[PDB]
């Protein structure tokens, strides 16, 4: 046992991959498009896993064979993995339109999302530099593939190509960090690396190998989560690639890499020596998010920079290693993920447009006004308007930054969040109260986006009325680390 | 003297990043891999030398050569005689681990090779099989026979 | 070597630590056989309704049933194992006190 | 070969006899080494094993000295490879020490 | 069975080879210590001659990476 | 804690000593002697620095005797 969430989603992907390939290449069925049929069974292989994973909550830690060799599951990995499967559930659900309406017979996009979700399930529970890297690269490779998928429009091909370059180079940096750390420590297991890196104090104790190793691991990660000084393509990556694959590689790698960072940087190496780069990254990420969001037009690129900025607002919870800080970071991932699944569900509802900016996003207050209400709710949530959930995320993050004595980090966070609040209030006003601007009309969204947008819109507005479950979950996850 | 001849790899690595003629770039790529395998031989890691040869300069730089040819860019030792009674060849002492103890880091590269297969298929099938060779998909009852253009 | 010793283990009275297969599956309560049966149904249905559009209703139903069998069986196994082992409610100790 | 110089050939040639005899000295040396691998701490047990084994060689080179010479000729010719001459191995073992 | 015969022969001659190597290495170590105490002159140099242990255990002194390869 | 030719690695013993310490010692210090032992095995930093100081003082004496 203890791999039943992985044993299943690997067997299910094979059952789907063989089932899809046999039919799509079948004369008897007139070569049908197996997308939305290997899907549906895809996202159920997710829910049955999410049921196999959530149920066996004490059983995930059922063996030792895995412990000091391969991967260690605990309450943090368990809760964060129930989230990845849930956030993979939303991401497959929002794509169902992209399979039927958009002409995709390529079902193996589904089985590649499923293999990537297995890679991420092994990232969350990755507890050894080798396992961390292997699962990271499994998910990153599935995502290079499914981001370079659209071969007709050259815009998605070069976007996927620079995504592959950026990801392979980020993984090279991360792997050189793993090499320096291993080479200077002779131990890759986080359980072993923890014992060595107690009292390491790089800035006080001369250890250059371990220092450069942790620095390169942090740089590789901050590349993967596309933080500010190393985003370097992330806007073009999110803009050029198709919309659902953007929704995938924009929310799920964040969750997974951030859980992986919590593993290596709060247990494998615990010191105030490494979180300095994350402090600088947080500052400049909130800065870049605010300003570039003020600058962008294309809604896809606007969401790209908004996600970069919000990833910044996450790392301030990691910029201090206190339990309140880690819990703030986890609160920030759940309220950033559910809100991003919502924003991408909205952007996927508007399939009719080509690559079009907020001006063409207009008229939604008139055509489909409830969708405009939902979009304003989501954008407010990113801004952090008090009566919403994103406010709770940013506010608990700032309160953890204050309790951690990083008053300047809280200050830059509040000024950047107020800049974002102004920009998004102005965006909502321009969308609602003026600027008709050419009235592009939309085919209706399907039930799958509808429930996800509806449930998530309910979650954002009716969150402060019941934050006890999520706060308990994230504080338990922080304690478990 | 062959120890310090890693300078060959060092300069050939500087060539690939400072070359406009792609044939020279791939040639010095192959050279970097050959000298890196020479190095991995000097360390006694014989298995990894041959694996570098095979899966780099018989597969990967083969790929890169294809991308160039087509699609042109334009004393005091104390040897302990224990642990020498049964010398473990590098393959045996990689197999004693990779397949039984760290076997999940070996079934995950299995999934990565499977994802590479699925990827090379979905990417470079190039509409040359059932991806689009299904049919032009033109039906009669759905046509208007051009009487009214 | 391997050992079934677990973290957060034995929260309930263990019945048979490390149950052998063909016993932990012969321990299926009429609830497990009802979990393994509802999962296989919700997986056959989503496997038929899904395939009516591409014309593959039969074979997509069969592959949804294969997914459901694998998943619901591994779930019934999780339950009956965490029951035989000390992980779950485990009210089936009468089966040991009687036999 | 010659006087009982504990060469490679003459040692791997008599290893059967060094196994039957001089087993206590060998196991004592190994017990020391597995206790602590510092060379000094059983230099005495090293002298002890080397003493009984040089004695065993000087014994094997007295009775059956021609047989214990053809077999070491083997083991020097084929470098300590047993199967390459089982004839010399048998003729040496059969004449005096089994 | 042939490989077990060969390995049994090797393990049996192992104590003699290891005793010879112990004597040789301890002689080289005595001469290296008498060289250290001579290059250091014992007033300015390492006030403790050998002091190589660095904890309660012994290890062969030092070398490059892999000589036997 | 493996080795390139089996055989318990080079200092899986030092790592077992540094892990048994970190197992039943409540602080990262008072188990740091074993940590420096283990890193000494890994990189031979102490041994190499001592050998280099030996050779450096020898070379300085020899040069002062040669050139004077």
């Amino acid at each position: 046992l203890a791999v039943f969430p992985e044993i299943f989603i690997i067997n299910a992907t094979f059952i789907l991959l063989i089932h899809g390939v046999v039919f799509s290449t079948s004369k008897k069925y007139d070569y049908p498009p197996l997308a939305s049929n290997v899907g549906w069974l895809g996202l159920l292989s997710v829910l049955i896993t999410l049921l196999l994973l959530a149920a066996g909550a004490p059983l995930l830690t059922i063996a030792h064979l895995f412990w000091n060799n391969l991967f260690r599951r605990d309450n943090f990995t368990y809760f964060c993995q129930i989230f990845l499967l849930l956030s993979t559930a939303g991401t497959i659900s929002m794509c169902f339109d992209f399979f039927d309406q958009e002409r995709f017979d390529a079902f193996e996009f589904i089985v590649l999302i499923l293999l990537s979700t297995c890679g991420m399930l092994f990232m969350i529970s990755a507890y050894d530099l080798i396992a961390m890297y292997l699962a990271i690269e499994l998910q990153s490779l599935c995502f290079y593939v499914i981001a370079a998928s659209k071969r007709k429009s050259e815009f998605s091909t070069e976007a996927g190509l620079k995504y592959l370059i950026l990801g392979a180079f980020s993984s090279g940096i991360l792997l050189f960090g793993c090499s320096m750390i291993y080479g200077s420590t002779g131990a890759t297991h986080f359980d072993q690396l923890a014992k060595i890196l107690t009292g390491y104090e790089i800035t006080g104790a001369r250890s250059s190998g371990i220092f450069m190793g942790i620095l390169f691991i942090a740089v590789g990660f901050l590349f993967k989560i596309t933080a500010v000084p190393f985003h370097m393509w992330a806007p073009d990556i999110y803009e050029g690639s198709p919309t659902p694959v953007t929704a995938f590689l924009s929310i799920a790698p964040k969750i997974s890499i951030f859980a992986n960072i919590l593993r290596v940087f709060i247990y494998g190496s615990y010191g105030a020596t490494l979180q300095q780069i994350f402090f600088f990254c947080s500052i400049a990420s909130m800065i870049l998010g605010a300003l570039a969001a003020m600058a962008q037009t294309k809604v896809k690129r606007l969401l790209a920079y908004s996600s970069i900025g919000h990833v910044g607002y996450i790392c301030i919870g990691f910029s201090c290693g206190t339990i309140e800080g880690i819990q703030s970071l986890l609160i920030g991932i759940f309220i950033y993920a559910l809100m991003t699944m919502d924003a991408f569900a909205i952007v996927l509802a508007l399939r009719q447009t080509r690559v079009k900016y907020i001006a063409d996003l207009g008229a939604l207050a008139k055509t489909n006004p409830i969708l405009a209400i939902t979009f304003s709710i989501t954008m407010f949530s990113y801004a952090g308007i008090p009566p919403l959930a994103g406010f709770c995320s940013k506010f608990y993050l700032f309160f953890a930054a204050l309790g951690c004595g990083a008053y300047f980090l809280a200050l830059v966070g509040v000024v950047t969040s107020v800049i974002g609040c102004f920009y998004y209030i102005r965006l909502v006003k321009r969308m609602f109260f003026d600027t008709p601007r050419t009235w592009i009309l939309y085919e209706p969204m399907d039930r799958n986006k509808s429930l996800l947008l509806a449930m998530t819109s309910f979650f954002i507005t009716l969150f402060l009325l019941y934050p006890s479950p999520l706060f308990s979950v994230t504080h338990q996850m922080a304690l478990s680390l | 003297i062959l120890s310090v001849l890693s300078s060959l790899a060092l300069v050939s690595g500087l060539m690939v990043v400072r070359a406009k003629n792609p044939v020279h770039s791939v040639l010095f790529f192959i050279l970097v891999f050959c000298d890196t395998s020479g190095l991995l031989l000097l360390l006694g890691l014989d298995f990894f030398a041959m694996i570098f040869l095979v899966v780099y300069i018989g597969a990967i730089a083969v790929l890169f050569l294809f991308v160039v040819m087509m699609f042109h860019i334009q004393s005091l030792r104390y040897t302990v005689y224990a642990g020498k009674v049964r010398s473990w060849t590098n393959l045996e002492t990689l197999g004693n681990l990779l397949y039984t103890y760290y076997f999940v880091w070996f079934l995950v590269p299995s999934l990565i090779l499977l994802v590479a297969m699925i990827g090379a298929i979905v990417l470079t099938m190039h509409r040359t099989t059932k991806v689009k060779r299904q049919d032009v998909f033109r039906r009669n009852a759905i046509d208007f026979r051009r009487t009214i253009m | 070597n391997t050992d079934i010793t677990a973290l957060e283990k034995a929260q309930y009275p263990v019945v048979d630590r490390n149950p052998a297969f063909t016993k932990v599956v012969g321990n299926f309560s009429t609830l497990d056989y009802l979990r393994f049966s509802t999962i296989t149904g919700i997986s056959v249905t989503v496997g038929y309704l899904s395939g009516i559009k591409p014309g593959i209703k039969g074979p997509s139903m069969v592959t949804g049933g294969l997914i459901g069998l694998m998943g619901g069986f591994m779930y019934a196994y999780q339950n009956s194992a965490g029951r035989l082992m000390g992980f779950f409610p485990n009210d089936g100790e009468v089966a040991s006190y009687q036999k | 070969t010659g006087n009982p110089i504990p060469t490679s050939a003459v040692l791997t040639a008599s290893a059967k006899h060094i196994g039957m005899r001089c087993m206590p000295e060998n196991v004592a040396f190994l017990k020391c080494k597995k206790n602590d691998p510092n060379p000094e701490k059983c230099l005495d047990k090293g002298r002890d094993v080397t003493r009984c084994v040089l004695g065993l060689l000087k014994d094997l080179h007295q009775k059956c000295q021609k047989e214990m010479d053809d077999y070491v000729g083997c083991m020097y010719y084929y470098t300590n490879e047993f199967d390459l001459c089982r004839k010399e191995q048998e003729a040496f073992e059969k004449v005096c020490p089994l | 069975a042939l490989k077990e015969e060969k390995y049994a022969a090797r393990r049996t001659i192992l104590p003699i080879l290891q005793a010879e190597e112990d004597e040789r290495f301890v002689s080289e170590w005595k001469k290296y210590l008498e060289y250290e105490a001579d290059v250091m002159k014992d007033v300015p140099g390492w006030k403790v001659g050998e002091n190589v242990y660095n904890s309660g255990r012994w290890m062969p002194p030092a070398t490059g990476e892999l000589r036997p390869d | 804690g493996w080795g390139i030719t089996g055989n318990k690695g080079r200092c899986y013993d030092f790592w077992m000593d540094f892990s048994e310490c970190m197992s039943h010692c409540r602080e990262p210090k008072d188990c740091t002697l074993l940590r420096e032992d283990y890193l000494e095995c890994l990189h031979h930093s102490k041994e190499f620095q001592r050998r280099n100081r030996i050779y450096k003082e020898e070379q300085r004496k020899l040069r002062a005797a040669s050139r004077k």
Partner: peptide
């Protein structure tokens, strides 16, 4: 989290061992 020794002592005897298989 000191979950290493419980496997080390557990499997040290099988392989990856310097001198036990000797005697």
């Amino acid at each position: 989290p000191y979950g290493f020794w419980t496997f080390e002592r557990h499997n040290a005897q099988l392989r990856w061992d310097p001198q036990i298989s000797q005697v």
